[PDB]
Design a protein around this ligand. Structure first.
Ligand SMILES: O=C(/C=C/c1cccnc1)c1ccccc1O
Lengths: 34, 34
């Protein structure tokens, strides 16, 4: 189970770029409107 | 896919991972102290 848990490095940079960008606007608006 | 403008997919992940990681601490602290 080394090629299916810690080989997601190329896939992470894709999903993490989409999630982190959506988080920057969401988390900020949540902490600004809290 | 010119190969000299839209081939920088892996190189972006390098600088983007280093910038976005350093930003996760800064943006969070700025939005938390706001
Ligand atoms: O092989 C890599 C994968 C990057 C990537 C970037 C975006 C979407 N899918 C994959 C890679 C990641 C970080 C730095 C250099 C790399 O070659």
């Amino acid at each position: 189970t080394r090629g299916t848990t810690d080989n997601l490095i190329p896939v992470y940079c894709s999903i993490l770029a989409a999630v982190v960008v959506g988080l920057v606007a969401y988390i900020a608006f949540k902490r600004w409107n809290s």
